[PDB]
Amino acid sequence: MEYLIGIQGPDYVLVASDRVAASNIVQMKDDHDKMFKMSEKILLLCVGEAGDTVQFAEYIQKNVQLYKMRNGYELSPTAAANFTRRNLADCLRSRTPYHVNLLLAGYDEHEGPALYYMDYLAALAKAPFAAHGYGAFLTLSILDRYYTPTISRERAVELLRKCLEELQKRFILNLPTFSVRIIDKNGIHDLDNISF
Amino acid sequence: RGYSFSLTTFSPSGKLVQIEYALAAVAGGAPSVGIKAANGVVLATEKKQKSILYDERSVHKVEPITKHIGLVYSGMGPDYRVLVHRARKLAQQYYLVYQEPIPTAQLVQRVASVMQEYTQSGGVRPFGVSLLICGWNEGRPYLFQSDPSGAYFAWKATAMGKNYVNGKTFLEKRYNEDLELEDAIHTAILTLKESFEGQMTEDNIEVGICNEAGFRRLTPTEVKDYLAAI
């Protein structure tokens, strides 16, 4: 059980993900990264079945980078989200479906920040905030309660923390640390891990 | 085995000579005429029919594609039958998807595309045929020609086959837009009579009409009626 979260402010998208790789009753890695850089202003966050998750995300990543090399400019976040969706949907009924749940976060020069949610069935929804994993059941209502559309990034990192503190308090799984990144006009920034 | 190389290629002056030579087969074919009237279309053709021995009803040059589209040709008969068969199949494929009879222009475009293939695909020659295709849809008549290259053209009236240059000039003199179908049938037959040789009968010409009720061949008795004035 893996957790992803995104929160879109006016000019930025904040994303976080747990850093655990688990197997059976053990955590096998405590500094795992569930984020994939697609381009200077796009992150794909990918969870789900082992093998499928990295294979799918890295395929998308290489194709996004290829588009940049072929054309001299990048796909927009929206175009990248639709490209991702097309591939997942096209594989749904094939001999090689990918059992993956995703967020795509991006910043476009002209359209601003965008956050997209996709499930393994390949339904795509744009959202102001979203979360995947069992931890979403405990945190989405906190986001519904405290969010606003104009939420500043200092305040957004607090809101994120409340979600993460709620997992420490109430969720049955041990998820002690989280990767945190923010995207804006100036590209992808690493923030400090949030750790307990 | 199938040869995979094109048998039609560019000459140093930029000509596709196999297509030009296919056009020469069409030019030596028996004459055909098409006239778009205000309320319908007529297609008319001469039978290159020797012999009283032929059963003139056994094979037709004027052929239905659908309830509303028909065609005739000049050039090589057997090649024509290929295109008739393909046109009929294209029209049904369209109907199965859209559940509406194929528009005349759409049918023409699809048949023309087949003709184009035979100018480029491996191990074949172009068709030695030009088609005249008539139809009625969107409350309006249509007359098209499709040539051995796969080029097509919409006409008010035209002629093809032997003596077509003079047939077109005969039609230029005689066609007007307000003309009705019955008058047009008459002028189509007169246009054939310009280059006929050997006395016209209802057995050595074929006539098809297209209007709001659909496409059909004229019967021998109907053609005999129109021939009495000529």
Binding site: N82, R86, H110 | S4, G14, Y142, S149, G150
Partner: protein, 248 residues
């Protein structure tokens, strides 16, 4: 069979591709076709070869094809070949829209068709397509754009160009009169007529003998229109008035 194969996809001794060169001669004889880029739009103007009195006039144009919401093209050369390529362009454009849910950028559509043309010069033993194309378009990356492609599978972007009959002379007239950065659709149109007037030395220019299409932007939407005959006759009139003013 080796005896009959004319070997359409081999090099000649000087490194030339003869079928491509010969296809280029076919194009040089086809109807004159020009493209002009302006600040507020892009136009195509073509000599009509369908001019016989008994022709019926059933489509909106003869040689101008809409490719998608934001692009059109015109053609010079073998018409049936042009029909195959224009159909393929439309398909490529819809495949890209399906995948990305945005319109295909203009240069990407041109490049994709040019890769098919290139393949026909390198393998498969088939004759090349005897077509050159002019493409006009708008996209969000480079705005108003004009491309040209030919049977080698080469292409380029132009402010103004010409293909088909008397191209060389048309390009000279464009080099001299085109004002880089300063053309409007109104002035590009005036120039298009000036050029066709000089390069159609088969007789006194008439609205029935040309087709003009414009591509503009209105309220965040691309508008592609084929000018009506009334408009074209007016442009020809204004050109003939201007040549009279020209002396004194």
């Amino acid at each position: 069979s080796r005896r009959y194969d004319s070997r359409t996809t081999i090099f000649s001794p000087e490194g030339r591709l003869y079928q491509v060169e010969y296809a280029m001669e076919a194009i040089g004889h086809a109807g004159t076709c020009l493209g002009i880029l302006a600040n507020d739009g892009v136009l195509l103007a073509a000599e009509r070869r369908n001019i016989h009195k008994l022709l019926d006039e059933v489509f909106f144009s003869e040689k101008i094809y809409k490719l998608n919401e934001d692009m059109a093209c015109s053609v010079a050369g073998i018409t049936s070949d042009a029909n195959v390529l224009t159909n393929e362009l439309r398909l490529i454009a819809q495949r890209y829209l399906l995948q990305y849910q945005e319109p295909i950028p203009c240069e990407q559509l041109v490049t994709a068709l040019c890769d098919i043309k290139q393949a026909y010069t390198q393998f498969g033993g088939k004759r090349p397509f005897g077509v050159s194309l002019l493409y006009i378009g708008w996209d969000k990356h480079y705005g108003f754009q004009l491309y040209q492609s030919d049977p080698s599978g080469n292409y380029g972007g132009w402010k103004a160009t010409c293909i088909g009959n008397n191209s060389a002379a048309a390009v000279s007239m464009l080099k001299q009169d085109y004002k880089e950065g300063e053309m409007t659709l109104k002035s590009a149109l005036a120039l298009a007529i000036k050029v066709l007037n000089k390069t159609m030395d088969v007789s006194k220019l008439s609205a029935e003998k040309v087709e003009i299409a414009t591509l503009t932007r209105e309220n965040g939407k691309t508008v592609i229109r084929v000018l009506k005959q009334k408009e074209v006759e007016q442009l020809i009139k204004k050109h003939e008035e201007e040549e009279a003013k020209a002396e004194r």
